[PDB]
Amino acid sequence: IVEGSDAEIGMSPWQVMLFRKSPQELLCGASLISDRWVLTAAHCLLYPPWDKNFTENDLLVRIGKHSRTRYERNIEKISMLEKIYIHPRYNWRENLDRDIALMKLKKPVAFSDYIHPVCLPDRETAASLLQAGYKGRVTGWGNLKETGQPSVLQVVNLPIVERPVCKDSTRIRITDNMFCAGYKPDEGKRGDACEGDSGGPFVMKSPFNNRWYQMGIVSWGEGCDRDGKYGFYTHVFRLKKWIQKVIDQFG
């Protein structure tokens, strides 16, 4: 996260760290959606252009974390993966369309003050909240700058951007399964996700029921926090049919 701030304790209890077993390193962010399911970006698990194709055994998920590098004894829980599910129409060849994946845990994780699931949006909550100008929140342990690393989880609030502006900021083909967020130049405020934050959540707090909903997944950007550029997020509600199908069939 660029131009963010330290998260408060328990501020993002659904935050998950995708962790490579060997060598031990941060792979991506992710989120807890139930006691057995974790949501992330498909590109965190499968990206042939960079020879990335992780299997269940290559990875762990660390839940309830705050410190980036520290083993948080009596706080974090480390879970093994039972199965990875990648959207069948994830477009890794072109533009990361449908950049979404689910990971089923071997055993349910115990909820605590630091571990708790985020809600997934229904049609109405998406319609009401996914509007240009409305701010969401992005969290992660990724780079503090494009060109270093945080001691603890970082947080930044960013406004959703009008679709024409998103499209005009890039040469990449933008789809209905993506939305973009961030401040416009000279707007006085900055901030963005960066390498290591991808797969993590873009959340909004419903003013109707005071619950946090995950509206996006940190998907891609051209650099981090560049003027005139915006971060792009997987549109969670647009892909909920697939999410439900996987959970209904394999849950």
Binding site: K21, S22, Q24, E25, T69, R70, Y71, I78, M80
Partner: peptide, 10 residues
């Protein structure tokens, strides 16, 4: 950088 995690998880 990263503190080693309990061997049981590996």
């Amino acid at each position: 950088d990263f503190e080693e995690i309990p061997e049981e998880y590996l």
